Point group: none
Chain length 244, copies 6
């Protein structure tokens, strides 16, 4: 009968190689970092622009005004809103979370994370969640580099002695306060309830294939998250503790 067909699957092949190949091909992917790095350089250069300057502007714009380019234009200076109007036109910018071939301010920050991680140190007080606010929650001075969701793309979870998990918990402390500020609906809700709202896309970002373990290592050292002896920074271990 058909029960025999289903039971016959006990002797059917289950190759860990081809299964993990399928897992990677089927896994959660909000957007392709390779595609938007490509679409930025191609669209920006075709419109004869310093696309490298535009990404720095789009990252500054994202960090301080959000991911709604059309909305932020109305409540901005005439000179500033003229730049934003040009950035929307050239890079075909959109709001929220659209398709894989669509560029958003949040995505530019995510794919070009080696610059966004630098920019965070100079405009920490102009952020939705200010640096001083974040310093009060953590106790010790919270790492400015971690003060944006795009930091997740730098986290290497497979780091020896479970260092990557401690970093993910440290960054989660910010993510909770960030979510409460972005959507005030979650301001009264419990800490673990808010943690589950960003758990899936952050995990997908940390498990990213764009930057290698070695690239992530160099980036994590560069912004002082880990010392030369691969040991974590004292503020990062405090933020992971306060996360619970």
């Amino acid at each position: 009968n058909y029960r025999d067909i289903a039971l016959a699957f006990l002797d059917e092949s289950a190759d860990s190689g081809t299964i993990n190949a399928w897992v990677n091909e089927f896994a959660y992917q909000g957007f392709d970092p390779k595609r938007i790095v490509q679409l930025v350089k191609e669209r920006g250069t075709a419109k004869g622009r310093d696309w490298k300057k535009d990404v720095k502007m789009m990252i500054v714009l994202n960090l301080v005004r959000g991911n709604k380019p059309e909305a932020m234009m109305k409540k901005m200076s005439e000179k500033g809103a003229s730049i934003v109007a040009n950035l929307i036109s050239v890079y075909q910018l959109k709001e929220g979370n659209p398709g894989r071939d669509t560029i958003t301010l949040s995505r530019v920050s995510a794919a070009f994370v080696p610059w966004t991680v630098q920019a965070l140190r100079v405009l920490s007080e102009s952020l939705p969640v200010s640096g001083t606010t974040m310093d009060a929650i953590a106790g010790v001075t919270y790492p400015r580099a971690m003060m944006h969701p795009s930091f997740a793309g730098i986290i290497d979870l497979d780091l020896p002695n479970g260092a990557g998990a401690t970093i993910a918990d440290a960054h989660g402390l910010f993510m909770i306060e960030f979510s409460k500020t972005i959507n005030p609906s979650l301001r009264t809700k419990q800490a673990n309830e808010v943690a589950a709202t960003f758990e899936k896309p952050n995990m997908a970002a940390m498990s990213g294939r764009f930057f290698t373990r070695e690239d992530k290592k160099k980036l994590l050292i560069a912004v002082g998250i880990i010392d030369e002896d691969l040991v974590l920074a004292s503020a990062v271990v405090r933020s992971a503790e306060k996360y619970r």
Copy 2:
């Protein structure tokens, strides 16, 4: 008079044998595993495809991305989403819990449970609830084979020495954490409250008539839950205790 006809039913036969035969035939049955095993083969072979490879893919897809094929396509790689688009077209896939003659990713997992129970061992960390997360709750290394609701179709409750009840309690430990991850609304709610949400469909799955007690015995022995002498594993007894 019609009152006489209704009263005449006092002398009408009420055979406990034929009534219990009707009770069993009218009982609650989640889906027809025979029909979906049939429709996968029929639809798959008609579109000249390796339907046996397709079920493996559909199971991998269900274990790692869920039961909404249309929704998971939008947040996936172009190569991956192209495979999913083909699987929806051939197998006429749908979402949630529709009619008996409708195929869903969760149903393919459930009916072809002898394969999915093997696949779970290689992609335990790619699951919504990771294996290492499940190991922390249980204390001892939690059985990977049990880390999906479809495992219920392998459970034989009528096992001697009440072994089937111990297995159902062991699988329930996962089901609680799985439900909290699927719907984050139940993350703050009490353990016994979450247990009642999946109690009825799991019981209906365990009381299934597709696989016989002998087939279930072979499957439970194969995956390593019980030995040939029908003795539960060191971890399956720990998981059932931590369940309370």
Copy 3:
């Protein structure tokens, strides 16, 4: 003047006989037991079926799966759901509480109560509220015949020494637990609050004109609630006490 006309109604006839005749003709009903016994016989015999076998099946089906025939089909065996599909087609079955000329599984149980009262004794553990569960609440073994709302149509409240009232209180003990199981919204509610939710339709059922006091007496004796000397069973008097 019109004051005269209205005042003239003081000497106008108000015969308690013709008023109670109107009260009975105008009273709340929901459905006509004579009409549904007629329609089952007429529809069943027209479609050349053993309609007497069908009513037993419809009763078994109602007791164990409810009053939604379309819904219960989807979560049932292919053989079982094929029988239900045939029963819906011939008897033009519907859900909930429709018109007086519409047949429902609950109505078949209500009008053919002399057979349903027998069926309850053999499938007591397959009921939404099991017999053993009912035995725990009552203390003494609860009468299986009373374990369905349709039992109300057999209750004669005008029984000497107020025996009928004791039966209505005994049946109410089940009705409370039955309501809490049917709608879990009433689970946390107080006992007297749940009692008022079914008080009106049960009273209307108990005041029914289909079965005469003599027919009700025969029915109540037939299922061991009372004996020829109108002495009601000890379990029935215990259930009425526990009802408070």
Copy 4:
């Protein structure tokens, strides 16, 4: 100057006679008892019917099934609903509280109150609020004649020693329980809060000019509320006390 015009109204006439004449002409009414007694007689006699029999039916129907003729038809016997369909057609019956020239079951009971006050004594247990329920609240046996809002049209507030106020308080005890039963929204709310919901239409009904003080006295005596020497019943005074 316009301030002079307004100030000139200090010397303008304020005749208590013509003001009370206006108060009576402007006071809250609802419907005209003369008009509905007329329209029942006119519509009834035009359709060649015993309209005097029909009002007794409409009253019985009203007391036991309410004021929604279309709604009560669906949950009634085929013979009964056929009578109601005829009564709606002839008397152009409507629901709730419409215009002055519209007939409703509640208005027929109000208009023809000398006949409804009699009917209440024979169908006290078939009422929405049963007589025995009303006896429990009052302590002493509550007057059956008072167990309907239409009783208000018999109350004479201008009775010596303020007897009319004591009757209005006794009838209010029923009105509270009646309102809670009609609309279950008011069941949990405070006694004085529910009292204000029916205070205005009841006051308008008691202040009625249809029946004279002498007619009201005769009616109040004929249904044992008072005697020839204007001394009220012991149950009415108890009901007025329990009202607070």
Copy 5:
């Protein structure tokens, strides 16, 4: 343009012309001059005794409220015919509309020297009866004060703080009036209800239509004060009981 805005530092800010603007722009509500004018204008144009019509509109407002369209449906055919004519001529509306719109409450407010007289003859036909008000105060409450429009007669700047005592005396009625108008405030505390009408009553007492001298004449006319500016004994008792 920054120079133009900064030049306003040397620009004139005359306290005289600013306070002249403040008085001209301050919160008025309705214009009593305009509605006295429009009543006299519209009334005389439709060849009516507009002086009789204002007394009718005042009687109508005191006993039936401010919704002319609504009160028509629940009124006598003769009465509702007068109200239909008054709406047509004086273009009457509901609630609180524009400054050039006439409402029953506004007619009572602007022609307060006549409304204050009418209150003495229909005290028992008011929403809050005079006898009810006599029970609360402990002394016979002034009938003239038994309407919110009385506030337009109060002169707060009266020597020895007499106006404040009158305001407190009128507040005792206003509390009971508010509880009757909106039964939502029936259970709420005395000081909580006092704040709901505090702002519009204060605005009414600070009114510019009647001068201190006109207010003195009006307060003298309806026995609140005498020639010597001495306050009535019932008015000082009502102000004391106000703090309850």
Copy 6:
């Protein structure tokens, strides 16, 4: 590959100067004070009116009756409402928070803040929150601070952190003002109400219309600061009571 391009951004310039220049150019505004000062003068002079008198009237009107010109007309004197009808017609006045080229009573008070700050001293008792009410909560509270438009005069980058003390002093009024404007926040906690106006006030204080030197002169003229940058005693008390 493209991973190399993204990694190359590690050596790409991140100059705090040009970044803060972008931050200022991209920051939240609401309306353009230059544009509304222009539109008032242009529309006012085109209708042959003393537009300088009209702004003082619009400011008085805003301070005492709010930002809904159509609504305040219905509950006003015939002479007063006639002036308001003319002001709406000439200056094309609107309600709430519309576009950058739209004039509102609140915007006239904000852009012409050097006059509104003077007007506040003479009509302090006619304000939604009276001056005497504000004196009770605080020492005599500065009348100049008794309106949200005062924020446009605050210079947060003042030495010894003087600007921050002024922002805390003005916040004491803003809390009581918010509770009066929306009675929904009357029972709510002090820090909860403080967060409702924190974002637009910060955006107003960080404004580029008036320079640090202009702001210094303004705060000096209305006695919050003296020619030696030392704070007024009432301003330091209001900042303390703010917590």
